Amino acid sequence: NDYCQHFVDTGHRPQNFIRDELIRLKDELIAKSNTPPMYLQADIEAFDIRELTPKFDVILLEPPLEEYYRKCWTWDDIMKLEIDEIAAPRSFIFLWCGSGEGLDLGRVCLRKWGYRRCEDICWIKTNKNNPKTLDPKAVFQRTKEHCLMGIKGTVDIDLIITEEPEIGNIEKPVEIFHIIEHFCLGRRRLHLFGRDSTIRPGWLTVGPTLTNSNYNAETYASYFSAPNSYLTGCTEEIE
Amino acid sequence: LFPPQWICCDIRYLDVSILGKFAVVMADPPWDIHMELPYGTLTDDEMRRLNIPVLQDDGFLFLWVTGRAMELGRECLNLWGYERVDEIIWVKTNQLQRIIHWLNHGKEHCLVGVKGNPQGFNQGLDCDVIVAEVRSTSHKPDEIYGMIERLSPGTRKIELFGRPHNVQPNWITLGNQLDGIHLLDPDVVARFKQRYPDGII
Numbered sequence: 082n083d084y085c086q087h088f089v090d091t092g093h094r095p096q097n098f099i100r101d102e103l104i105r106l107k108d109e110l111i112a113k114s115n116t117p118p119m120y121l122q123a124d125i126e127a128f129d130i131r132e133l134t135p136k137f138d139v140i141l142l143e144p145p146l147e148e149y150y151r152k153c154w155t156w157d158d159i160m161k162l163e164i165d166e167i168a169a170p171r172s173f174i175f176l177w178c179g180s181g182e183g184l185d186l187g188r189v190c191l192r193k194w195g196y197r198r199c200e201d202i203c204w205i206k207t208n209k210n211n212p213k214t215l216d217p218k219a220v221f222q223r224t225k226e227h228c229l230m231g232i233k234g235t236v237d238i239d240l241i242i243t244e245e246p247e248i249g250n251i252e253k254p255v256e257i258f259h260i261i262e263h264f265c266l267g268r269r270r271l272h273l274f275g276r277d278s279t280i281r282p283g284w285l286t287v288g289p290t291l292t293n294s295n296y297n298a299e300t301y302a303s304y305f306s307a308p309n310s311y312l313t314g315c316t317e318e319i320e
Numbered sequence: 321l322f323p324p325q326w327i328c329c330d331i332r333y334l335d336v337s338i339l340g341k342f343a344v345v346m347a348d349p350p351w352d353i354h355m356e357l358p359y360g361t362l363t364d365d366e367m368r369r370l371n372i373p374v375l376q377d378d379g380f381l382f383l384w385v386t387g388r389a390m391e392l393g394r395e396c397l398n399l400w401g402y403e404r405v406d407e408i409i410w411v412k413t414n415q416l417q418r419i420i421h422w423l424n425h426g427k428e429h430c431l432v433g434v435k436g437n438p439q440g441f442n443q444g445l446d447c448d449v450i451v452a453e454v455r456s457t458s459h460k461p462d463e464i465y466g467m468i469e470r471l472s473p474g475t476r477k478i479e480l481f482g483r484p485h486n487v488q489p490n491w492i493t494l495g496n497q498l499d500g501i502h503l504l505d506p507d508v509v510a511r512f513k514q515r516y517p518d519g520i521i
């Protein structure tokens with residue numbers, strides 16, 4: 082059966098018909114390792130990023146693109162972020178890119194801050210509860226977003242399938258956090274452009290819409306002072 | 321001439337200028353993806369040097385990428401004069417509709433580049449996600465010919481590095497495992513005889 086034809090016929094995106102412990106202790110081990118959640122309201126355009134210390138093992142960059150809203154950041158603004166200055170020598174980035182120019186401009190950024198792309202994670206949005214308006218350049222209906230993963234220095238698939246959120250809901254699937262956390266990449270984890278609704282144990286959120294802050298660089302670096310500096314986030318805490 | 325046509329050859333050495341202009345190009349190149357080779361790869365410069373620009377004036381390029389070709393194909397796609405404007409991903413399932421480095425790969429990507437100013441194309445009929453069963457290895461799903469047909473019906477299309485199961489009405493398949501030359505468009509036949517009078521390329 083041809084689900085591309087079926088979509089031309091009925092409006093059901095092909096992904097709608099994708100079908101369908103053991104790794105559960107690694108979830109407890111992440112949770113035991115997770116630092117207290119930390120959050121800081123900041124206007125990142127006008128905020129000297131270096132103030133965020135120490136260097137991060139993982140950065141999750143979720144800038145508010147105008148394409149999400151059918152204050153927005155252009156790729157002009159994102160590129161000029163000095164991400165290289167707060168990223169640990171060996172470290173990872175997960176960059177939400179949307180589905181338009183970002184799939185290219187986000188790769189420019191990854192190279193600009195000095196990462197090589199190792200993984201292209203697609204969020205495929207089903208429309209099971211509503212069998213869209215197009216971008217001028219668009220050739221097909223765009224039914225997914227891309228989260229690019231970059232590495233610098235020396236269980237899970239690259240897909241997240243969920244139902245298209247309500248128009249004007251800009252949240253990305255929490256599953257990205259599981260994928261990231263199951264990688265065991267370190268505990269200094271930074272979420273740039275989080276919201277109140279994205280604050281999470283084992284993460285530092287920084288964003289303009291945060292209503293409360295609790296960040297303290299000194300308190301923050303104490304979660305990683307010896308003997309905890311090199312943990313993966315997937316091991317038992319040291320006694 | 322609507323029915324299938326194909327050319328066994330090496331897209332490196334074939335003078336693609338004889339084939340005229342196409343509404344859609346599709347290419348499934350053997351990128352050197354710094355891994356072990358179960359087929360002859362092309363080098364990055366051989367990739368860059370491919371004479372894709374002569375094939376179109378206004379129309380669409382479809383370009384399968386994987387690994388570091390995701391970046392490199394963006395380079396070739398740009399060098400050849402295309403802007404990337406979409407990107408299809410094919411979700412690989414089995415017969416029961418469940419999905420088949422750092423992550424396990426559940427998909428293959430196909431960049432969509434545009435060139436010139438195409439007009440009269442049915443933009444927005446399909447969506448950028450394919451769900452289709454994996455057949456052989458290195459085997460693109462037939463569904464993409466339907467999306468390309470709806471997008472630009474009746475028009476001339478050309479496929480690079482196709483295999484023999486890929487030969488479709490309205491297409492000309494180029495590949496090194498096809499069974500000789502089979503050409504029906506007379507203008508093509510003419511130019512082919514003119515450029516290759518002794519039949520060898």
Ligand SMILES: O=C(NC[C@@]1(O)CCCN(c2cc(NCc3ccccc3)ncn2)C1)c1ccc(CN2CC3(CCC3)C2)cc1
Pocket residue numbers: 329330331332348349350351359360361362384386428458459460461481482483494495496497
């Ligand atoms: O290569 C491959 N398959 C062997 C061929 O034989 C096949 C027939 C056509 N084909 C040439 C190759 C050619 N030059 C090559 C050459 C260079 C040096 C010495 C000998 C040959 N010229 C003229 N047709 C190459 C190949 C390419 C891409 C992929 C990956 N994608 C496939 C994918 C789409 C969806 C799944 C993703 C997998 C396999």
